[PDB]
Amino acid sequence: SNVPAELKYSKEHEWLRKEADGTYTVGITEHAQELLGDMVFVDLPEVGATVSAGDDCAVAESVKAASDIYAPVSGEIVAVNDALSDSPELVNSEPYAGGWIFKIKASDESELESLLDATAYEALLEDE
């Protein structure tokens, strides 16, 4: 599967993209959406919520499965992708683009060290 070289990743099959203001945009990977199948619901976090790294904060549900989506870093949820409430299949068709799930302002920069680069995420995929 497609593993964009510029992104960061979690072992739970999330990606993170740093934006110009320093916030991160978070979604699930091409591999993740492929395994879940045809998406029917994305339960979004509350804007303004404070989360710790590893907290469950969204859910992706398909016709066959559902999975928790974890905060990859600690911080405040600053935006959510409201389009997924009516078009959850964007997660399937454009997991790195229109299928983004939420944006987070990180509270502890040190946590970024626990994130994977693209090479490590590819290796992880090759390791299932």
UniProtKB/Swiss-Prot annotation:
Residues 23-105 form the Lipoyl-binding domain. GO terms for biological process: glycine decarboxylation via glycine cleavage system; one-carbon metabolic process. SUPFAM superfamilies: Single hybrid motif. The modification N6-lipoyllysine is found at K64. Binds 1 lipoyl cofactor covalently. InterPro entries: 2-oxoA_DH_lipoyl-BS, Biotin_lipoyl, GCV_H, GCV_H/Fam206, GCV_H_sub, Single_hybrid_motif. Keywords: Lipoyl. PROSITE patterns: BIOTINYL_LIPOYL, LIPOYL. One of its GO terms (cellular component) is cytoplasm. The keyword Signal does not apply. It comes from the Bacteria. Its cofactor is (R)-lipoate. Belongs to the GcvH family. The glycine cleavage system is composed of four proteins: P, T, L and H. The glycine cleavage system catalyzes the degradation of glycine. The H protein shuttles the methylamine group of glycine from the P protein to the T protein. NCBIfam families: gcvH (TIGR00527), PRK01202.1 (NF002270). This is Glycine cleavage system H protein. It comes from Escherichia coli (strain K12). The gene is gcvH.
